Design a protein around this ligand. Structure first.
Ligand SMILES: CC(=O)Oc1ccccc1C(=O)O
Ligand SMILES: CC(=O)Oc1ccccc1C(=O)O
Lengths: 122, 122
């Protein structure tokens, strides 16, 4: 669910997850997909494509189990869809941390999200 | 379409539409519906419920016809879905104008939209 996702993002990036990514670029946070603006935004595009494949569960609402083994996020066995959901979230949390060097505060509150150019199909 | 909605909001409110309303509150702009924060947000709640009842046309992309008779927006009935769509947009532009006295800049970039309390059924 968004709660586990937020926790992973807070721990990997050190940033306030909703403030920093909740409306960022054409793909992060609320809304849908669009042509990515930068490397952070591409992380978020890959994540929304990941959610789009999960028909067996609800990515926004469904809880799942995961733990930390030293510095590694480990997704618990769950059921098939919930395990894949956890892997989507783990992957984007790591991606956002690795791309902090090009995070652009100008893109943080993108009130033009509905006018983004059309994204490539997932 | 959102192009015409934008033009209606700019002329009725005098404000930059996407900047001032594109992420405002729990109901305005990108995303879905949520428990409304204030009178401006309730305008947007009514509008999203208005879009939901339309069938047979696309409220974000489909262009409709309208004109100005002095100060009055007049929807030309293209077909019945498109007339209703125009009437949804006219109503919200007038509503936002009448509530400028209560517009709160603090709600303008609501990065917590996904966490809004679930809206009542339309
Ligand atoms: C905007 C936000 O904080 O939510 C999301 C995060 C990841 C994927 C989807 C969403 C959403 O709100 O739709
Ligand atoms: C989000 C924004 O600026 O667009 C909208 C306006 C009214 C209704 C819906 C939308 C949308 O993007 O979904």
């Amino acid at each position: 669910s968004l709660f586990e996702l937020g926790k992973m993002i807070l721990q990997e990036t050190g940033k306030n997850p909703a403030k920093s990514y909740g409306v960022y670029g054409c793909n992060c946070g609320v809304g849908g997909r669009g042509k990515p603006k930068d490397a952070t935004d591409r992380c978020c595009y890959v994540h929304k494509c990941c959610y789009k494949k999960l028909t067996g569960c609800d990515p926004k609402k469904d809880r799942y189990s995961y733990s930390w083994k030293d510095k590694t996020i480990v997704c618990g066995e769950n059921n098939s869809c919930l395990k894949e959901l956890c892997e989507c979230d783990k992957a984007v949390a790591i991606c956002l941390r690795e791309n902090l060097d090009t995070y652009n505060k100008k893109y943080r509150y993108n009130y033009l999200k509905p006018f983004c150019k059309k994204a490539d199909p997932c």
